[PDB]
C-alpha cells in the first residue's frame, strides 16, 4: 500500500509509486527520474500512463522495455495539461532526465514535488519565481548540518588534475571509474577529455549512455576497451581484488591503475578538505573516494526553502524513524523563524 507522501491530494496523481500494484484512483503515474528506488515495480507489462521527461522515457523504453503507448514524455519549462490539471516539469540538477514537478490544483493550491534534487540559486529564476507554493514535497537526504561537501566544479578540478598528473608521470597507467546507476557522468567524461581518450565500457553501460541526449556522445564513448585509457566498471569491482583482476585482462598494456569511487557524503568530509584527500594504495593500485553529490547539502537546502517560503513541508527521505522525523521538523521551524514566513 502506497504511502501518503507519494500521493497528490485533489488529483488522480501519484509520484514514484510503481511498487504498490494498481493504486486506487490513480489515472497518471509520474516518474521523477530513472533511479531504481523510484522506478521499483515498472517492467514491460505495465499498462497505465507514465508521465516523465524525454530522457527518462528513452530509458523506460530501451532498458525496462515499457511499451511506447504507455510512455508520455513532456518538455521542460512548459505549461502542460494532464487529465485536466496544469503541470510544469523543471530541471532537478540531479542525474540526467531528473525533474521537479509543479502541480496547479483545481482549487487554487500550488504543490512543488522536488523528486531528488541538488538545490541551486539558479532555481530562484525558473518558473518558480512567478507564484506562491502552498506545499513542498522535499528531498531531505542531507537535512542535518554535519552534511557538508564541495561544489561539483571543485571535485571535478581535483579529479582532472589527479588523473593528468599520474598519466603524464606514467604513460602506462590506466584510469578506472566506478558506476552503478545513471548520474555523475561528468567524473569520467572530464577525466577522458583531459587525457585525449574515449571512455571504454560494457555494451550494457554504452546502451544506457546512448539514451541520455548528451551532445556529441559518439565522439566521447566506446565499447572498444583496447582503444581507451579510461575504463568504466561496476562500483562493486572498485577494490584491490577487482582491479587486479581487471589489469590481467588488459594484455600487458598497463602496469598501474588509478581508480575513482564517486560516493555521496562520507564522515571523512567532517575532517578533510578536497585538496587534502589521499588514496588507498596496494602495490601498483591506488583508489580515490571523491565526494561528488547529486543531492543538496544542508546549506543549499536551507537556502532554497528560505527563498521559496512554503506554507507546509512534507519530507520524502529519512521518513522511517521518529528521531529523523523530529530532527527534520526542528530545522524546518528554525528556518521559518529565522526568515519570518
Ligand atoms: Ni536519485
Swiss-Prot record:
Report the outcome of residue 139 to N: Impaired nuclear focus formation, reduced interaction with PIAS and increased sensitivity to cisplatin
Stated induction or repression of this protein's expression: During mitosis. The mRNA encoding this protein contains an internal ribosome entry site (IRES) in its 5'-UTR. This 5'-UTR generally suppresses translation while specifically promoting expression during mitosis, when cap-dependent translation may be impaired.
State which tissues express it: Expressed in brain, heart, kidney, liver, pancreas, placenta and skeletal muscle.
Subcellular location(s): the record lists: Nucleus
Q: What does this gene product do? A: May be required for DNA interstrand cross-link repair. Also required for checkpoint mediated cell cycle arrest in early prophase in response to mitotic spindle poisons. Possesses beta-lactamase activity, catalyzing the hydrolysis of penicillin G and nitrocefin. Exhibits no activity towards other beta-lactam antibiotic classes including cephalosporins (cefotaxime) and carbapenems (imipenem).
- Family from the record: Belongs to the DNA repair metallo-beta-lactamase (DRMBL) family.
Q: How does it assemble?
A: Binds constitutively to TP53BP1. Binds CDC27, which is itself a component of the anaphase promoting complex (APC). Binds PIAS1.
Q: What is this protein called?
A: DNA cross-link repair 1A protein
From which lineage does this chain's organism come?
A: Eukaryota, Metazoa, Chordata, Craniata, Vertebrata
**Name of the gene encoding the protein in the UniProt record:** DCLRE1A
Amino acid at each position: 500500500t502506497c504511502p501518503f507522501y507519494k500521493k497528490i491530494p485533489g488529483t488522480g496523481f501519484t509520484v514514484d509509486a510503481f511498487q504498490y500494484g494498481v493504486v486506487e484512483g490513480c489515472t497518471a503515474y509520474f516518474l521523477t527520474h530513472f533511479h531504481s528506488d523510484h522506478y521499483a515495480g515498472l517492467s514491460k507489462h505495465f499498462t497505465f500512463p507514465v508521465y516523465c521527461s524525454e530522457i527518462t522515457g528513452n530509458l523506460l523504453k530501451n532498458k525496462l522495455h515499457v511499451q511506447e503507448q504507455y510512455i508520455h514524455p513532456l518538455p521542460l519549462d512548459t505549461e502542460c495539461i494532464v487529465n485536466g490539471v496544469k503541470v510544469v516539469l523543471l530541471d532537478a540538477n540531479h542525474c540526467p532526465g531528473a525533474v521537479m514537478i509543479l502541480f496547479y490544483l483545481p482549487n487554487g493550491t500550488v504543490i512543488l514535488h522536488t523528486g531528488d534534487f541538488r538545490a541551486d540559486p539558479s532555481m530562484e529564476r525558473s518558473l518558480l519565481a512567478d507564484q506562491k507554493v502552498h506545499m513542498l514535497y522535499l528531498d531531505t537526504t542531507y537535512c542535518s548540518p554535519e552534511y557538508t561537501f564541495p561544489s561539483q566544479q571543485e571535485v571535478i578540478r581535483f579529479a582532472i588534475n589527479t588523473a593528468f598528473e599520474a598519466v603524464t608521470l606514467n604513460p602506462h597507467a590506466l584510469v578506472v571509474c566506478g558506476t552503478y546507476s545513471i548520474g555523475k557522468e561528468k567524473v569520467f567524461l572530464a577525466i577522458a577529455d583531459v587525457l585525449g581518450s574515449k571512455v571504454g565500457m560494457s555494451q550494457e553501460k554504452y546502451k544506457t549512455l546512448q539514451c541520455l541526449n548528451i551532445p556529441e556522445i559518439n565522439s566521447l564513448i566506446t565499447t572498444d576497451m583496447c582503444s581507451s585509457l579510461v575504463h568504466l566498471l561496476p562500483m562493486m569491482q572498485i577494490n584491490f581484488k577487482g582491479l587486479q583482476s581487471h589489469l590481467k585482462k588488459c594484455g600487458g598494456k598497463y602496469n598501474q591503475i588509478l581508480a575513482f569511487r564517486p560516493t555521496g557524503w562520507t564522515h571523512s568530509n567532517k575532517f578533510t578538505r578536497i585538496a587534502d584527500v589521499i588514496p588507498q594504495t596496494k602495490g601498483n593500485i591506488s583508489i580515490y573516494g571523491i565526494p561528488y553529490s547529486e543531492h543538496s547539502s544542508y546549506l543549499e537546502m536551507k537556502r532554497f526553502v528560505q527563498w521559496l517560503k512554503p506554507q507546509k513541508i512534507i519530507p520524502t527521505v529519512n521518513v522511517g524513524t521518529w528521531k529523523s522525523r523530529s530532527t527534520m521538523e526542528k530545522y524546518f521551524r528554525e528556518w521559518k523563524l529565522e526568515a519570518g514566513y
